[PDB]
Amino acid sequence: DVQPAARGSIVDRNNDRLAFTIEARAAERQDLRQYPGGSLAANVVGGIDWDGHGLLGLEDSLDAVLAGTDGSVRHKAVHGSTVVLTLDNDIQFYVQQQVQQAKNLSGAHNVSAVVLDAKTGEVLAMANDNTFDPSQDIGRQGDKQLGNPAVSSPFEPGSVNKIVAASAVIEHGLSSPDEVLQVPGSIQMGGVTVHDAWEHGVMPYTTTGVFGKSSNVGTLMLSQRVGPERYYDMLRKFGLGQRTGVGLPGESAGLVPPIDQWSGSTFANLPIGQGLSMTLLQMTGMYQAIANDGVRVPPRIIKATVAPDGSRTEEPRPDDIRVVSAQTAQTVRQMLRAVVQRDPMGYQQGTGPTAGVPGYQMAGKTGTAQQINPGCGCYFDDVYWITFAGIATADNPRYVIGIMLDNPARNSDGAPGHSAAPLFHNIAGWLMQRENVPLGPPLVLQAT
Ligand SMILES: [Co+2]
Ligand SMILES: [Co+2]
Ligand SMILES: [Co+2]
């Protein structure tokens, strides 16, 4: 009487298979879900239940599309459609492996990374350490990561958030990259006191240097020029506090305090990246807006759907969101080259010189954010999220890379420190090499 729908498969943008079903026998005939790559992208793909329906991940959230509908006799069986992801399996495999050995080397609790296509915001790689293997029983893997923290697990971004302040002061004509400023070692603002992570008297930092050296005081002084209302607007336009609509189960919206609810001290914390939370995808999505000449395209992981006959429907593209002008975006890309610039005399070195790749205009921002102590309701003093986000390249944006490390003891390469910059170096460099992309004057971060 019953005519079974054949489960559709999940494939990457080039039709490389991630999940597919084959026929077998045992309740006599029995279909088997194959995952040829094992843990590859299984944070996204998910896994199967005993009945052959989705258990978690996209297998679950797109089950209706993938399972089809059983026929009868007369009602035709509707076989499952094939789901085409924006993932590139080669990029995903490299990134997923590098994320695991950044976790091993740095001693972090966990590590995640997102690679977006610069122009479309398509998700080319999304990875966390400790990924489960859906070709194996779920009950054996309680020590594994079974979900997708890159979309589900918000954190406070720290100084990586300073892209919002940089974007607002340039977009509103309030400063320029070469403006020589006067930055004291500390400021009192909205009832509180904010220090730079190093002691110093008044320094002649350029606006470029404020972001290249990651001066909190400099950032807040420039943010005073913007004001809370224009700053909050830009937060919202960069997409923070809102789900992206990426097409993955369990996405978190993050948290941005509405302006009508700020305390006297909110404006002293938000521009430097404390007092708000975002997912790794939102964070990378911010840098995609600047990479795409100021036009934010919400990220997407589903590329198209293929019906059982073989006809393909592309996923509808989300609408553009103009965050800043193309002129603003290009100026911010160039300023962020200062973060990766080297200077043996020290004066003109950014915070992330190991993130630079010689021959390329790499641009990015380093981050360190205190986590909240569960037992006191107050910040830990030596527990941090380490963040990095960057663009390959500033003059030719192709890839946007976002990284977070949960409280590492060392760099992502295993050297002393607490920086995600070497992980960005590895990934962005490998992306340039494999596409055979071929190879000006130093930026001024500090006047005299
Ligand atoms: Co009927
Ligand atoms: Co240390
Ligand atoms: Co290298």
Coordinates of C-alpha atoms and ligand atoms in Angstrom, one line a residue:
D1 CA 0.0 0.0 0.0
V2 CA 2.7 2.6 1.0
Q3 CA 5.3 4.1 -1.4
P4 CA 8.2 5.7 0.4
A5 CA 9.6 9.1 -0.2
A6 CA 13.4 9.0 -0.7
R7 CA 15.2 11.4 1.6
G8 CA 16.8 14.3 -0.2
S9 CA 20.5 15.1 0.3
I10 CA 22.4 18.1 1.6
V11 CA 25.3 19.4 -0.6
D12 CA 27.7 22.3 -0.7
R13 CA 27.7 25.1 -3.3
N14 CA 29.6 22.9 -5.7
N15 CA 27.3 19.8 -5.1
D16 CA 29.9 18.1 -3.0
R17 CA 27.8 15.7 -0.8
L18 CA 27.5 16.3 2.9
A19 CA 24.6 14.0 3.7
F20 CA 22.8 11.5 1.4
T21 CA 20.7 8.3 1.8
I22 CA 21.3 4.8 0.4
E23 CA 19.0 1.8 0.4
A24 CA 19.6 -1.2 2.6
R25 CA 17.8 -4.1 4.2
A26 CA 17.0 -5.2 7.7
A27 CA 10.7 -3.6 8.9
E28 CA 12.6 -5.2 6.0
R29 CA 13.9 -2.3 3.8
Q30 CA 15.8 0.4 5.6
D31 CA 17.5 3.6 4.4
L32 CA 20.9 4.7 5.7
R33 CA 22.0 8.3 6.0
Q34 CA 25.6 8.6 4.8
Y35 CA 27.9 11.4 6.1
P36 CA 31.1 10.9 4.0
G37 CA 32.9 13.8 5.7
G38 CA 32.2 12.7 9.2
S39 CA 32.3 15.8 11.5
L40 CA 32.7 18.1 8.5
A41 CA 30.2 21.0 8.9
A42 CA 28.2 18.8 11.2
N43 CA 27.5 21.8 13.4
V44 CA 25.4 23.0 10.4
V45 CA 24.3 19.7 8.8
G46 CA 23.0 18.0 12.0
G47 CA 22.1 14.4 12.2
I48 CA 19.5 11.8 11.6
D49 CA 17.1 10.0 14.0
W50 CA 16.4 6.3 14.1
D51 CA 13.2 6.8 11.9
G52 CA 15.3 8.5 9.2
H53 CA 14.0 12.0 10.0
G54 CA 16.1 14.8 11.2
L55 CA 17.3 14.8 14.8
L56 CA 19.1 18.2 14.9
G57 CA 20.8 20.7 12.7
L58 CA 19.5 21.3 9.1
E59 CA 18.4 17.7 8.9
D60 CA 15.8 18.6 11.5
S61 CA 14.9 22.2 10.6
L62 CA 14.6 21.4 6.9
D63 CA 13.2 17.9 7.5
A64 CA 10.0 18.7 5.6
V65 CA 11.9 19.7 2.5
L66 CA 14.3 16.7 2.8
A67 CA 11.9 14.0 3.8
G68 CA 9.2 14.7 1.2
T69 CA 5.9 12.8 1.5
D70 CA 5.0 9.2 1.2
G71 CA 2.7 8.0 -1.6
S72 CA 0.0 5.4 -1.7
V73 CA -2.1 3.0 -3.9
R74 CA -3.4 6.6 -6.0
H75 CA -1.2 9.4 -4.6
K76 CA 2.3 10.0 -6.0
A77 CA 5.2 9.8 -3.6
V78 CA 7.0 13.2 -3.3
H79 CA 10.6 12.5 -2.9
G80 CA 12.7 14.9 -0.8
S81 CA 14.4 17.8 -2.4
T82 CA 18.1 18.4 -2.3
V83 CA 19.4 21.3 -0.2
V84 CA 22.4 23.3 -1.6
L85 CA 24.4 25.2 1.0
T86 CA 26.6 28.2 0.5
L87 CA 29.4 26.3 2.2
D88 CA 32.5 25.5 0.3
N89 CA 33.6 22.2 1.6
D90 CA 37.3 22.8 0.9
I91 CA 37.3 26.1 2.8
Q92 CA 35.1 24.5 5.5
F93 CA 37.5 21.6 6.0
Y94 CA 40.6 23.7 6.3
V95 CA 38.9 26.2 8.6
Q96 CA 37.3 23.5 10.8
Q97 CA 40.7 21.9 11.3
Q98 CA 42.5 25.2 12.0
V99 CA 39.8 26.0 14.6
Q100 CA 40.4 22.7 16.4
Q101 CA 44.2 23.2 16.5
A102 CA 43.7 26.8 17.7
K103 CA 41.7 25.4 20.5
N104 CA 44.3 22.8 21.3
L105 CA 47.3 25.2 21.1
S106 CA 45.7 28.2 22.8
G107 CA 44.1 26.3 25.7
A108 CA 40.7 28.0 25.1
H109 CA 37.5 26.5 26.3
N110 CA 36.2 26.7 22.7
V111 CA 37.0 28.3 19.4
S112 CA 34.8 29.3 16.4
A113 CA 35.3 30.9 13.1
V114 CA 33.0 32.2 10.3
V115 CA 34.0 33.0 6.7
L116 CA 31.6 35.1 4.6
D117 CA 31.8 36.0 1.0
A118 CA 32.5 39.7 1.1
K119 CA 30.0 40.9 -1.5
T120 CA 27.0 38.5 -0.9
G121 CA 27.5 37.6 2.8
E122 CA 27.0 34.0 1.9
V123 CA 28.5 31.7 4.5
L124 CA 31.5 29.9 3.0
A125 CA 32.6 28.3 6.3
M126 CA 31.2 28.1 9.8
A127 CA 33.1 26.0 12.3
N128 CA 33.6 25.3 16.0
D129 CA 36.1 22.9 17.8
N130 CA 35.0 19.6 19.2
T131 CA 32.4 18.9 16.4
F132 CA 30.4 15.7 16.8
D133 CA 30.3 13.0 14.2
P134 CA 26.7 12.3 13.0
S135 CA 27.7 9.0 11.4
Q136 CA 27.9 7.8 15.0
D137 CA 25.4 7.4 17.8
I138 CA 24.6 10.6 19.6
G139 CA 24.6 8.9 23.0
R140 CA 28.3 8.3 22.8
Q141 CA 29.1 11.9 22.2
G142 CA 28.1 13.8 25.4
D143 CA 31.6 15.2 25.5
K144 CA 31.2 16.7 22.0
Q145 CA 29.8 19.9 20.6
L146 CA 26.5 18.9 19.0
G147 CA 25.2 22.4 18.3
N148 CA 26.3 25.5 16.4
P149 CA 27.7 28.2 18.8
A150 CA 28.7 30.5 16.0
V151 CA 24.9 31.4 15.8
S152 CA 23.5 30.3 19.2
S153 CA 26.0 31.6 21.7
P154 CA 26.4 35.4 22.1
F155 CA 29.4 37.1 23.8
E156 CA 30.6 40.6 24.5
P157 CA 32.7 41.6 21.5
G158 CA 35.2 44.0 23.2
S159 CA 37.3 46.2 21.0
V160 CA 36.2 44.4 17.7
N161 CA 33.0 46.5 18.3
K162 CA 35.0 49.7 17.6
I163 CA 34.2 49.4 13.9
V164 CA 30.9 51.0 14.8
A165 CA 32.5 54.1 16.3
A166 CA 35.0 54.3 13.4
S167 CA 32.1 54.1 10.9
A168 CA 30.0 56.8 12.7
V169 CA 32.7 59.4 13.1
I170 CA 33.8 59.1 9.5
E171 CA 30.3 58.8 8.1
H172 CA 29.1 61.9 9.9
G173 CA 32.1 64.0 8.9
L174 CA 33.3 64.2 12.6
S175 CA 36.9 63.2 11.9
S176 CA 39.3 61.9 9.3
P177 CA 42.0 59.2 9.4
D178 CA 44.9 61.7 9.6
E179 CA 43.4 63.9 12.3
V180 CA 46.0 64.2 15.1
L181 CA 44.2 63.9 18.4
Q182 CA 45.2 64.4 22.0
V183 CA 44.4 61.3 24.0
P184 CA 44.9 61.2 27.8
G185 CA 45.5 57.9 29.7
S186 CA 42.0 58.0 31.2
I187 CA 38.7 59.9 31.0
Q188 CA 35.7 60.4 33.3
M189 CA 32.5 59.9 31.3
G190 CA 28.9 59.4 32.4
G191 CA 29.7 59.0 36.0
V192 CA 32.5 56.5 35.5
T193 CA 36.3 56.3 34.6
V194 CA 37.8 54.5 31.6
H195 CA 41.5 53.7 31.2
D196 CA 43.5 52.6 28.3
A197 CA 44.9 49.0 28.6
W198 CA 48.4 50.7 29.0
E199 CA 49.3 53.7 31.1
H200 CA 50.3 56.8 29.2
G201 CA 50.1 60.6 29.3
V202 CA 48.5 62.6 26.6
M203 CA 49.5 60.9 23.3
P204 CA 49.3 62.4 19.8
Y205 CA 47.4 59.5 18.3
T206 CA 45.9 59.9 15.0
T207 CA 42.3 58.7 14.5
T208 CA 43.9 55.8 12.6
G209 CA 46.1 55.1 15.7
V210 CA 43.1 55.2 18.0
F211 CA 41.7 52.2 16.3
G212 CA 45.2 50.7 15.4
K213 CA 46.4 50.8 19.0
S214 CA 42.8 50.3 20.4
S215 CA 42.7 53.3 22.7
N216 CA 39.5 53.2 24.8
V217 CA 39.9 56.9 25.6
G218 CA 40.4 57.8 22.0
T219 CA 37.4 55.7 21.0
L220 CA 35.2 57.3 23.7
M221 CA 36.3 60.9 22.8
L222 CA 35.4 60.3 19.1
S223 CA 32.2 58.7 20.2
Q224 CA 31.3 61.8 22.2
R225 CA 31.4 63.6 18.8
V226 CA 28.9 61.2 17.4
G227 CA 26.5 61.3 20.4
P228 CA 24.3 58.5 21.8
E229 CA 21.5 58.8 19.3
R230 CA 23.6 58.6 16.1
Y231 CA 25.8 55.9 17.7
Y232 CA 22.8 53.7 18.7
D233 CA 21.3 54.1 15.2
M234 CA 24.5 52.8 13.7
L235 CA 24.5 49.8 16.1
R236 CA 21.1 49.0 14.8
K237 CA 22.0 49.5 11.1
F238 CA 25.0 47.1 11.6
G239 CA 22.4 44.5 12.5
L240 CA 23.1 44.1 16.2
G241 CA 20.4 42.8 18.6
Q242 CA 18.6 41.3 15.6
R243 CA 18.6 37.8 14.2
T244 CA 20.2 37.7 10.7
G245 CA 17.7 35.2 9.2
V246 CA 20.6 33.0 8.1
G247 CA 18.5 29.8 7.9
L248 CA 19.9 27.8 10.8
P249 CA 18.1 26.6 13.9
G250 CA 18.9 28.1 17.3
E251 CA 20.1 31.5 16.2
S252 CA 20.4 34.0 19.0
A253 CA 19.5 37.7 18.6
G254 CA 22.2 38.9 21.0
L255 CA 21.5 41.9 23.2
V256 CA 21.8 45.7 22.7
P257 CA 20.2 47.9 25.4
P258 CA 17.6 50.2 23.8
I259 CA 18.7 53.8 24.1
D260 CA 15.7 54.8 26.2
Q261 CA 17.0 52.4 28.9
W262 CA 20.7 53.3 29.1
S263 CA 22.1 54.0 32.5
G264 CA 24.4 57.0 33.0
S265 CA 27.3 54.7 32.0
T266 CA 26.1 52.8 29.0
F267 CA 27.7 55.2 26.5
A268 CA 31.0 54.7 28.3
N269 CA 30.9 50.9 27.7
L270 CA 29.1 50.2 24.4
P271 CA 31.6 51.9 22.0
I272 CA 34.5 49.8 23.3
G273 CA 32.5 46.6 23.2
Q274 CA 31.2 45.9 26.7
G275 CA 27.6 46.0 27.8
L276 CA 26.2 44.3 24.7
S277 CA 26.4 40.8 23.3
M278 CA 26.4 39.4 19.7
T279 CA 27.0 36.1 18.0
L280 CA 30.0 35.4 15.9
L281 CA 27.9 35.6 12.8
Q282 CA 26.5 39.1 13.7
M283 CA 30.1 40.2 14.4
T284 CA 31.4 38.9 11.1
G285 CA 28.3 40.4 9.5
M286 CA 29.3 43.8 10.7
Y287 CA 32.6 43.6 8.9
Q288 CA 30.9 42.3 5.8
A289 CA 29.0 45.6 5.6
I290 CA 32.3 47.6 5.5
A291 CA 33.8 45.1 3.1
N292 CA 30.8 45.5 0.7
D293 CA 31.3 49.3 0.3
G294 CA 29.0 50.0 3.2
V295 CA 26.1 47.8 2.1
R296 CA 25.3 45.1 4.7
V297 CA 23.8 41.9 3.1
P298 CA 22.4 39.6 5.9
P299 CA 24.3 36.3 5.7
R300 CA 22.7 33.1 4.3
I301 CA 23.7 29.5 4.3
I302 CA 21.0 28.0 2.0
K303 CA 21.9 28.7 -1.6
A304 CA 19.2 26.8 -3.6
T305 CA 16.8 23.9 -3.5
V306 CA 16.7 21.1 -6.2
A307 CA 13.4 19.4 -6.8
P308 CA 13.3 15.6 -7.5
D309 CA 13.1 16.2 -11.2
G310 CA 16.3 18.2 -11.2
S311 CA 15.0 21.8 -11.5
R312 CA 16.8 24.3 -9.3
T313 CA 15.3 27.2 -7.4
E314 CA 17.7 29.8 -6.0
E315 CA 17.2 31.0 -2.5
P316 CA 15.8 34.6 -2.5
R317 CA 18.5 37.1 -1.8
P318 CA 17.9 39.3 1.2
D319 CA 17.6 43.0 0.7
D320 CA 20.6 45.4 0.9
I321 CA 21.0 47.6 4.0
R322 CA 23.0 50.7 3.4
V323 CA 25.0 51.2 6.7
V324 CA 27.5 53.9 5.5
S325 CA 28.6 55.3 2.1
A326 CA 31.1 53.5 -0.2
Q327 CA 33.5 56.4 0.6
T328 CA 33.1 55.7 4.3
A329 CA 33.5 52.0 3.9
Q330 CA 36.7 52.3 1.9
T331 CA 38.2 54.8 4.4
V332 CA 37.4 52.4 7.3
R333 CA 39.0 49.5 5.4
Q334 CA 42.2 51.4 5.0
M335 CA 42.3 52.6 8.6
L336 CA 42.0 49.0 9.9
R337 CA 45.2 48.2 7.9
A338 CA 46.9 49.9 10.8
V339 CA 45.9 47.1 13.2
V340 CA 48.2 44.7 11.2
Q341 CA 51.0 47.1 10.5
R342 CA 54.5 46.4 11.9
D343 CA 56.9 49.0 13.2
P344 CA 60.3 47.9 14.9
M345 CA 60.4 51.4 16.6
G346 CA 57.0 50.5 18.0
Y347 CA 55.4 53.9 17.5
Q348 CA 53.6 52.9 14.3
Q349 CA 52.7 49.3 15.2
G350 CA 49.1 48.2 15.6
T351 CA 47.8 45.6 18.1
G352 CA 47.7 42.7 15.5
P353 CA 50.8 42.7 13.4
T354 CA 50.8 38.9 13.2
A355 CA 47.5 39.1 11.4
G356 CA 49.1 40.9 8.4
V357 CA 50.0 38.8 5.4
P358 CA 52.9 40.5 3.4
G359 CA 51.9 41.3 -0.1
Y360 CA 48.2 41.9 0.8
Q361 CA 46.2 44.8 2.2
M362 CA 44.8 42.8 5.2
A363 CA 42.6 44.8 7.5
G364 CA 41.1 43.8 10.8
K365 CA 40.5 44.5 14.5
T366 CA 41.7 42.6 17.6
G367 CA 39.5 42.2 20.7
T368 CA 39.6 41.3 24.4
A369 CA 36.4 41.4 26.4
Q370 CA 35.9 40.5 30.1
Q371 CA 33.4 37.8 30.8
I372 CA 30.8 38.1 33.7
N373 CA 31.6 36.1 36.8
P374 CA 28.6 33.7 37.3
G375 CA 28.9 33.9 41.2
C376 CA 29.1 37.7 41.8
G377 CA 27.2 39.3 38.9
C378 CA 30.4 41.2 38.1
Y379 CA 33.2 41.0 35.5
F380 CA 36.0 38.5 36.0
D381 CA 39.3 40.2 36.0
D382 CA 41.3 37.5 34.1
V383 CA 38.6 35.7 32.0
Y384 CA 38.2 37.0 28.4
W385 CA 36.6 36.4 25.1
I386 CA 39.4 37.0 22.5
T387 CA 38.0 38.2 19.1
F388 CA 39.3 39.0 15.7
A389 CA 37.5 40.1 12.6
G390 CA 39.0 41.0 9.3
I391 CA 38.7 41.5 5.5
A392 CA 40.9 40.0 2.7
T393 CA 41.6 42.5 1.2
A394 CA 41.1 46.2 1.9
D395 CA 41.5 47.1 -1.8
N396 CA 39.8 44.0 -3.1
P397 CA 37.3 42.6 -0.6
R398 CA 36.7 38.9 -1.2
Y399 CA 36.5 37.2 2.2
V400 CA 35.4 38.3 5.7
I401 CA 36.7 36.3 8.6
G402 CA 35.4 36.4 12.2
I403 CA 37.1 34.5 15.1
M404 CA 36.4 34.1 18.8
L405 CA 38.4 32.2 21.4
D406 CA 36.8 31.5 24.8
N407 CA 39.5 32.4 27.5
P408 CA 42.7 31.1 25.9
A409 CA 45.9 30.8 27.9
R410 CA 48.1 31.4 24.8
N411 CA 47.8 32.7 21.3
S412 CA 46.0 30.6 18.7
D413 CA 49.4 29.5 17.5
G414 CA 50.5 28.5 21.0
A415 CA 52.9 31.5 21.6
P416 CA 52.6 33.6 24.8
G417 CA 49.7 36.0 24.8
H418 CA 46.0 35.8 24.1
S419 CA 45.5 36.7 20.5
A420 CA 43.4 35.3 17.7
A421 CA 45.5 37.3 15.1
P422 CA 47.6 34.2 14.1
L423 CA 44.5 32.3 13.3
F424 CA 43.3 35.0 11.0
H425 CA 46.8 35.1 9.4
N426 CA 46.7 31.4 8.6
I427 CA 43.1 31.4 7.1
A428 CA 43.3 34.6 5.2
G429 CA 46.7 33.8 3.7
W430 CA 45.6 30.3 2.7
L431 CA 42.5 31.8 1.0
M432 CA 44.7 34.2 -1.0
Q433 CA 47.2 31.5 -2.1
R434 CA 44.6 28.9 -3.2
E435 CA 43.0 31.5 -5.6
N436 CA 46.4 32.7 -6.7
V437 CA 45.6 36.3 -5.9
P438 CA 48.8 38.3 -6.7
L439 CA 50.8 40.6 -4.4
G440 CA 51.6 51.7 -0.1
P441 CA 53.3 54.1 2.3
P442 CA 53.1 53.3 6.0
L443 CA 50.1 54.6 7.9
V444 CA 50.6 57.2 10.7
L445 CA 49.1 56.1 14.0
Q446 CA 51.1 58.4 16.3
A447 CA 52.2 62.0 15.5
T448 CA 54.9 63.7 17.6
Ligands
CO1 CO -7.0 9.9 -2.3
CO2 CO 48.7 36.3 30.0
CO3 CO 52.8 33.1 7.9

